Design a protein around this nucleic acid. Structure first.
Ligand SMILES: Nc1ncnc2c1ncn2[C@@H]1O[C@H](COP(=O)(O)OP(=O)(O)OP(O)(O)=S)[C@@H](O)[C@H]1O
Ligand SMILES: Nc1ncnc2c1ncn2[C@@H]1O[C@H](COP(=O)(O)OP(=O)(O)OP(O)(O)=S)[C@@H](O)[C@H]1O
Ligand SMILES: Nc1ncnc2c1ncn2[C@@H]1O[C@H](COP(=O)(O)OP(=O)(O)O)[C@@H](O)[C@H]1O
Ligand SMILES: [Mg+2]
Ligand SMILES: [Mg+2]
Ligand SMILES: [Mg+2]
Ligand SMILES: [Zn+2]
Lengths: 645, 245, 647
DNA sequence: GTGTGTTTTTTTTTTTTTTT
DNA sequence: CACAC
């Protein structure tokens, strides 16, 4: 075990070389000590340290190569060295009589460049076993959090002595050791009865998730492939199904593969999985950034400056989908949806939803699906759905069975996963009626209920619904009222804040402008691409893993996403009496209007007006709603209903 | 087994085999290959007495549609055949040669043959920075009187196209065209199995008897023939795969 | 080998200080816990609730005068299981003698004690025998710490902070924690064996075997000294009379909707309650349960299959629910506030207009009483209304204010059988039976299938639903007041179209309802304006625009119904005469109207009028059914009938 | 002392198919 | 795997 000590001491020398890790350890220890000294508080920092592989390579290339080649013999010594360093500089406070027994090993985390070890579940060949690799994918299945024993403490009530027995498993420790029968020793060696001392025994949270590659880099004619990852201790519950992620960990192998006289000729392989060491939640489909995008002070200052622009609303609306010609009011409604109004959690169980749900029905090839595709590519949490390609069980909740434990469980559907997000439903008229009541309940009360298979639960899906629909006929018939032109119940239409009618009327000047714009779009050439060259995709932009006035016509899409996130987080507008007068006046005028006879205008339209005013106040970043918000909301609603302007 | 080699009134016989190392991921389902291997035996414990499961251990593959993907989405083209392709591209009458090379047994139908050539070539896929994409496939429908070799044209297209799936109008279900949610018999878990049109990813699907589409089955292709994507939300599975067919 | 570790807990000093605490604690009669132990000796109590506040106060007292404590409050939150046995042994050591003439007619354990003592003593002179748990007729539980509001709560006292299921990390195993959550499934009471009391066929010996493993093996081998020395090899016979059993219940508590992060699924936790805490929980309970968090093992062969991955449960110790003085108060409200008008607005303060529908809701909440048969005291109304009218909000408010009130949509009741394969339970409930002595708020009554149609029918003329799974024909009582919130088909209601043609419900079922109202919205200049003002004010202040008396508590209706149920306002002979001529003239005007045929007067309308008058007098003292009562009931009925003929 | 035996599952959810 | 047959 001399090599183990040599690796330990070289790692400690490396740690002393870069004191930033020492400062991070000190900060974590003092934060935990202060929280312990300070009440309804439960936020405790973990015993994990994130290092950069580049610094290790610069200091000792041999150690870095051993880490990236055979981590099973290099990371345990590093963990021991980190634990020794932490204890040495530990504030040595009064022991809790538990931390002495309850071990707290200091986990290791990694970031930086990985090279050929940045892989995908499809490309994870068997040659990478026992080698540390980084794999990107989507979380699809998550087993229930299940603690497991690693160390049992027992008290002998005949000698007054505490005996500990450490338990090891192939899924717990990297180095292979004899599995322990997981039996508590009830008797001492000297015939003394031992009582199992819970609380002083040590258990760790364990989880088993499934990570599969991107559907979009999945090769033609092949379905995405998946691997199993074992998150442990801190990493449990840090991810949920439907999350894009990049995990860094050891590609380990388990099982007997037959080879036990049970299967001598049978050709079954071995169990392969990943013991996750680091999780980095890349999201927003940008391939390298998280959903909660970091906001620099310069970006916040620029956002504040642009908030003083008079027509910033119009600029952002037009900057949404530049490649989509026209449809300006639709873009305004989309921008309002992406960053909507406030949700009122009233008393006595009353609940007023703040999400905006818009149904837009129109003629074929009117960019109805492309608008939803753009919203999917832009929104922080957007889930795609097809009316034909969807089942209510697969839309809300599915009663499956667990495999790690072997018993019943619920799995989230398409809208539950989109909680606090947006659901883009194409071919809305094509949805099955039996499962259409479920989405109706969703958009009605933002909650689903399950009362089957001995499971009586109520899940929350506070999503914003955008739907694209086609007329009953091949095209819309303006000679008919907008009830028979739609094959959906008017009760289903009522819960939508806005219903947008798209007509593909054949103009000449407008058609010429559309054709010119579409041709300008189609003649675009990517910067790093030549003419007559196929647009190949690799997306291996993860060169490093982890964190490693003004009047512009159109802003960049990531900047717009940052602005939307900052607005949703920061400003909580308050409705104002000046907006109240305008809202009530417009609601009264629209309600008792002759042209509004065909309209379904009811009290829900007042809720739509309030939500639109709140969203428009969010657009201005004003912490209170104002008259201009009410005027713009009334104009947009009047456009949605009548379409005159 | 090859459909042309099945016995009369007999369903095709399946047979399991195993690749190894460099032979792994050499082909994809739907491809016609030839295998030289060892006819081996293993005893599965899953209903007679002293029965033994037969299989093949592979020692060679001879395909004609290249490796996984379309030659792994890159050129496996040797210099001689590439130079021959360049020489063919410089033929001024190449358009006429290709038109005459489409369904030679089918008389006339020159415009249809030229449209088939255009479809087999297809446009260039465009991916804008803003996020939405522009497809590069061509969708062609052939209406007309029966007995005009339209089915023969579809069969020839399926024969000549590197990736092609030929389907019948009546024998077609929406869950069988794009994706089927099936429960795993052993693990009791649901999973997706690619449909007919998915197997034709990057190629072409020749749907005969298009008038015999079930109205609930015909609509299921509206998204995928335009967006080139298939959205599935079933049995706790929510995915959006690509089908550029 | 078994390695050893050193831990500063000092179980011996802790036990001695525990004895000192029990003996020498006098809360601000003698010591409280010595009084409780004496009462236990009097067989007047078998539930020792160890309050953490008492231990904390004892530590506070002795800290000022010697610091003779080791922070036991923090010391037992680390491993409460051992301290439970420590407290049990302390109670047994300081167990007082009985100070009451308790009858010992059923003293089987005492009989066994004295018999075995005499049997041992007759050879002891040569001319522990009993388990410590067996002698105990009591059970000990822990009461969690209250709020501190002091520096002692320096993130400590984990039992004082209500956790959620997701907050229960594996490190908390062995701690005494607490959770806040809603039950979903409670098991039945079952006898779990504590110690078996085998008796040998020969050698006359009885051997005890304590078991805490959820599964054990019989002895059936006379290892007793006499049997062993004689080599008789007698088999042991299990004896329920001398064996010790404990009532047990296994609940399955889920986490509240607020404790679930976005895009996640609520979890569950199994709770093992035993002793006198059994039967203290129901599925419809939202509670703060404090107990010991323990890793229930896969003892047997499944442990080998699974490994170190164990399962967890909570050994609950304390439960706190969340959910004629009031009688004098409701007379005060009656004299001050006009219930007919004030409580009408109180039902739907946030809903503007439709005050008569609110009064009908009050009458339905009160309900008639004609239990004598020869009928029914349930008032039923259907709110067909019009899409866009706040019928759903009215039903939600009724559900939140009516005791045993449940709300559901037409499309989701009914019943199910043997939902879990493992336990194979019997006769699961539904939604209609949930509001047995309550009201069911049926939204989407139109979008409701023939099966539930016949179910709610059988309920409404039977006050009971029935199922026939396998010819069992078992039935579940549901005397539920029916509150329907259907809406006219094809969206908006058509006044020109007949009301029964506007809704896809059978006319027979509709006529059997006691009363029905058309409340459809019509675009006006002022009513919409005032409603918009109301909604805007609610948005401003998160509260109603209080312009009148707005009582909140619904227990006033509870007092009214409980008071006047026994009273049973007797109909007067003049009442019967006036209602009989009322029926005569109502049928006459129904014929002379024959414009919609639904306006025909029926004896069912007479039953509805009788029960409405009964409810009216039920709210107003007793025997108020007179000319005024029947006039009010007939006015309401005629208003409802004209509502169908509105415009 | 050599060699066993469990724990161990068919629900709910899709997809098809014939009637209705 | 390991305790019970
Ligand atoms: N122009 C043509 N040249 C050669 N053969 C032809 C031509 N038109 C028709 N045929 C023959 O006519 C037959 C047509 O059969 P199919 O192709 O199966 O039917 P179809 O023409 O597609 O029309 P359907 O399927 O009945 S609507 C084949 O035997 C063809 O060879
Ligand atoms: N008189 C009213 N007072 C207050 N709010 C009202 C009133 N009428 C309607 N509302 C509002 O309208 C909404 C409730 O309408 P709903 O009850 O859902 O309409 P509906 O007739 O039940 O349509 P359904 O659900 O298809 S039957 C809430 O936002 C209420 O605030
Ligand atoms: N206003 C527009 N500007 C630019 N392109 C448009 C517009 N309307 C339609 N298109 C084009 O039509 C094509 C198909 O649109 P699609 O999303 O299928 O509409 P729909 O869902 O109504 O059929 C898209 O490729 C898009 O480029
Ligand atoms: Mg489209
Ligand atoms: Mg044909
Ligand atoms: Mg409603
Ligand atoms: Zn005996």
């Amino acid at each position: 075990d001399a090599v183990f000590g040599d690796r330990v001491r070289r790692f400690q020398e490396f740690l002393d070389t870069f004191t930033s890790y020492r400062d991070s350890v000190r900060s974590i220890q003092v934060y935990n000590s202060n929280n312990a000294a300070n009440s309804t508080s439960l936020n405790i920092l973990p015993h994990r340290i994130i290092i950069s592989l580049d610094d290790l390579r610069e200091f000792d290339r041999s150690f870095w190569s051993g880490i990236l080649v055979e981590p099973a013999y290099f990371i345990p010594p590093a963990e021991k060295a980190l634990t020794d360093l932490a204890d040495s500089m530990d504030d040595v406070p009064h022991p809790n009589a538990s931390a002495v027994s309850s071990r707290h090993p200091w986990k290791l985390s990694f970031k930086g460049s990985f090279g050929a070890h940045a892989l995908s579940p499809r490309t994870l060949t068997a040659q990478h076993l026992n080698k540390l690799v980084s794999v990107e994918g989507i979380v699809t299945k998550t087993s229930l959090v299940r603690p497991k024993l690693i160390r049992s403490v027992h008290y002998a009530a005949k000698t007054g002595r505490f005996h500990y027995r450490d338990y090891t498993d192939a899924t717990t420790t990297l180095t292979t050791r004899i599995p322990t029968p997981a039996i508590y020793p009830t008797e001492d060696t000297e015939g003394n009865k031992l009582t199992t001392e819970y609380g002083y025994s040590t258990f760790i949270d364990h989880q088993r998730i499934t990570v599969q590659e991107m559907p979009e880099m999945a090769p033609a004619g092949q379905l995405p492939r998946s691997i199993d990852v074992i998150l442990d201790d801190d990493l449990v519950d840090k991810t949920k199904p439907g999350d894009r992620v990049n995990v860094v960990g050891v590609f380990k192998s388990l099982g007997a593969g037959g080879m036990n006289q049970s299967n001598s000729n049978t050709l079954i392989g071995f169990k392969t999985l990943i013991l996750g060491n680091t999780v980095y939640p890349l999201h927003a489909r940008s391939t390298g950034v998280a959903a909660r995008q970091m906001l620099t002070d310069f970006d916040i200052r620029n956002i504040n400056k642009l908030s003083k622009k008079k027509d910033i609303f119009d600029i952002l609306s037009q900057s949404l989908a530049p490649s989509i010609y026209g449809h300006d009011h639709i873009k305004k409604a989309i921008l309002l949806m992406l960053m909507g109004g406030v949700e009122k959690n009233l008393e006595n169980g009353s609940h007023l939803r703040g999400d905006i749900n818009i149904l837009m029905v129109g003629d074929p090839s009117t960019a109805k699906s492309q608008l939803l595709r753009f919203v999917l590519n832009t929104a922080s949490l957007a889930i795609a759905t097809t009316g034909r390609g969807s089942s209510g069980v697969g839309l809300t909740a599915a009663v499956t069975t667990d495999r790690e434990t072997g018993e019943r469980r619920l799995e989230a559907g398409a809208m539950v996963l989109a909680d606090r997000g947006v659901v883009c439903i194409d071919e809305f008229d094509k949805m099955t009626d039996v499962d259409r009541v479920a989405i109706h309940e969703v958009m009605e009360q933002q909650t689903v209920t399950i009362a089957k298979a001995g499971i009586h639960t109520t899940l929350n899906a506070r999503c914003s619904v955008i739907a694209a629909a086609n007329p009953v006929f091949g095209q819309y018939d303006v000679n008919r009222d907008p009830h028979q032109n739609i094959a959906l119940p008017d009760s289903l239409l009522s819960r939508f804040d806005l219903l947008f009618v798209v007509t593909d009327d054949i103009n000449e000047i407008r058609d010429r402008s559309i054709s010119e714009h579409v041709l300008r779009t189609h003649r675009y050439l990517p910067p790093g691409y030549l003419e007559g060259e196929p647009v190949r995709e690799r997306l291996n932009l993860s060169l490093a893993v982890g964190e490693d006035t003004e009047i512009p016509k159109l802003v960049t899409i990531p900047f717009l996403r940052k602005y939307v996130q900052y607005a949703k987080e920061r400003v909580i507008p308050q409705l104002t009496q000046e907006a109240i007068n305008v809202i009530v006046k417009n609601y009264t005028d629209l309600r008792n209007d002759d042209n509004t006879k065909k309209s379904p205008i009811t009290a829900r339209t007042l809720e739509t007006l309030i939500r639109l005013a709140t969203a428009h106040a969010k657009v201005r970043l004003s912490k209170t709603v104002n008259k201009v918000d009410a005027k713009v909301a009334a104009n947009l609603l009047r456009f949605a209903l009548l379409g005159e302007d | 087994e090859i459909p042309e080699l099945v016995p009369v009134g007999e369903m095709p016989r399946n047979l399991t085999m195993t690749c190894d190392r460099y032979l792994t991921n050499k082909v994809i389902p739907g491809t016609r290959v030839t295998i030289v291997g060892i006819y081996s035996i293993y005893n599965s414990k899953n209903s007679g007495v002293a029965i033994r499961t037969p299989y093949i251990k592979i020692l060679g593959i001879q395909s004609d549609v290249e490796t996984s993907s379309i030659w792994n989405s890159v050129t496996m083209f040797t210099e001689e055949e590439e130079e021959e392709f360049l020489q063919l591209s410089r033929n001024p009458k190449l358009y006429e040669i290709l038109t005459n090379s489409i369904a030679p047994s089918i008389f006339g139908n020159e415009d249809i043959k030229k449209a088939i050539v255009c479809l087999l070539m297809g446009g260039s896929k465009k991916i804008l920075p803003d996020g939405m994409r522009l497809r590069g496939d061509i969708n062609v429908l052939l209406l007309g009187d029966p007995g005009t070799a339209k089915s023969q044209l579809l069969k020839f297209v399926e024969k000549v196209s590197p990736i092609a799936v030929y389907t019948s109008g009546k024998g077609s279900s929406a869950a069988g065209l794009t994706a089927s949610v099936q429960r795993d018999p052993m693990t009791r878990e649901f999973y997706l199995e690619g449909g007919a049109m998915v197997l034709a990813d990057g190629g072409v699907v020749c749907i005969d008897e298009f008038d015999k589409m079930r109205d609930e089955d015909r609509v299921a292709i509206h998204e995928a023939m335009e967006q080139q994507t298939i959205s599935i939300a079933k049995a706790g599975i929510t995915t959006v795969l690509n089908s550029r067919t | 080998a078994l390695p050893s570790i050193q831990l500063p807990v000092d179980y011996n000093n802790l036990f001695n200080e525990i004895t000192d605490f029990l003996v020498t604690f006098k809360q601000d009669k003698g010591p409280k816990y010595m009084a409780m132990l004496q009462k236990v000796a009097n067989r007047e109590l078998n539930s020792v609730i160890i309050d953490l506040d008492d231990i904390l106060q004892y530590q506070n007292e002795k800290f000022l005068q010697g610091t003779q404590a080791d922070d036991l409050v923090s010391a037992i939150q680390q491993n409460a299981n051992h301290f439970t046995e420590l407290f049990c042994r302390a109670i047994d050591n300081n167990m007082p003698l009985p100070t009451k003439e308790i009858d010992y007619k059923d003293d089987v354990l005492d009989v066994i004690l004295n018999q075995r003592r005499l049997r041992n003593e007759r050879m002891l002179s040569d001319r522990e025998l009993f388990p410590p748990n067996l002698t105990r007729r009591y059970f000990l539980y822990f009461k969690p710490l209250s709020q501190n509001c002091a520096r002692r709560y320096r993130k400590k006292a984990i039992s004082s902070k209500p956790l959620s299921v997701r907050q229960i990390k594996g490190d908390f195993l062995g701690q005494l924690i607490t959770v806040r959550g809603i039950i979903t499934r409670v098991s039945d009471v079952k006898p779990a064996v504590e110690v078996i009391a085998y008796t040998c066929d020969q050698c006359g010996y009885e051997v005890f075997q304590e078991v805490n493993s959820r599964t054990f093996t019989p002895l059936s081998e006379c290892t007793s000294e006499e049997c062993s020395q004689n080599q008789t090899k007698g088999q042991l016979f299990m004896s329920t009379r001398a064996s010790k059993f404990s009532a047990f219940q296994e609940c399955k508590i889920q986490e509240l909707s607020q404790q679930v992060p976005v895009g996640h699924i609520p979890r569950s936790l199994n709770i093992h309650v035993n002793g006198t805490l059994v039967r203290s929980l129901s599925p419809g309970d939202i509670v703060d349960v404090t107990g010991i968090f323990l890793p229930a093992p896969y003892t047997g062969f499944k442990a080998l299959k699974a490994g170190l991955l164990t399962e967890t449960y909570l050994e609950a110790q304390f439960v706190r629910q969340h959910k004629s003085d009031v009688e004098e108060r409701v007379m005060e409200l009656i004299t001050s506030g006009d219930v007919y008008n004030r409580l009408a607005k109180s039902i739907a303060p946030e809903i503007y207009g439709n005050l008569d529908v609110k009064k009908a809701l009050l009458l339905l909440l009160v309900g008639g009483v004609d239990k004598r048969v020869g009928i029914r005291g349930d008032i039923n109304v259907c709110l067909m209304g019009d899409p866009g009218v706040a019928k759903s909000q009215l039903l939600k408010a009724i559900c939140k204010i009516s005791p045993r009130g449940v709300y559901t949509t037409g499309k989701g009741t009914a019943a199910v059988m043997k939902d879990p394969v493992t336990d194979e339970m019997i006769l699961e409930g539904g939604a209609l039976v949930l509001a047995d002595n309550g009201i069911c708020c049926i939204d989407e009554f139109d979008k409701m299938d023939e099966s539930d149609r016949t179910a709610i029918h059988e309920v409404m003329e039977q006050q009971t639903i029935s199922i026939s799974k396998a010819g069992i024909n078992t039935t579940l009582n549901a005397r539920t007041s029916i509150l329907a919130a259907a809406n006219p088909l094809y969206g908006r209601y058509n006044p020109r179209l007949s009301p029964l043609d506007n809704i896809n419900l059978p006319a027979a079922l509709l006529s059997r309802f006691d009363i029905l109202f058309l409340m459809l919205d019509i675009p006006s200049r002022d009513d919409d304006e005032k409603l918009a003002e109301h909604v805007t004010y609610v948005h401003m202040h998160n509260k109603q625009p209080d312009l009148d008396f707005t009582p909140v508590e619904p227990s006033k209706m509870r007092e009214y119904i409980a008071y006047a149920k026994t009273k049973r306002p007797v109909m007067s002979e003049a009442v019967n005469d006036y209602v009989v001529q009322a029926y005569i003239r109502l049928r006459q005007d129904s014929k002379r109207e024959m414009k919609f045929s639904f306006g025909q007067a029926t004896p069912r309308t007479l039953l509805g009028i009788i029960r409405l008058s009964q409810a009216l007098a039920k709210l107003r003292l007793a025997d108020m059914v007179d000319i005024d009562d029947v006039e009010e009931a007939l006015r309401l009925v005629r208003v409802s009938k004209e509502s169908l003929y509105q415009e």
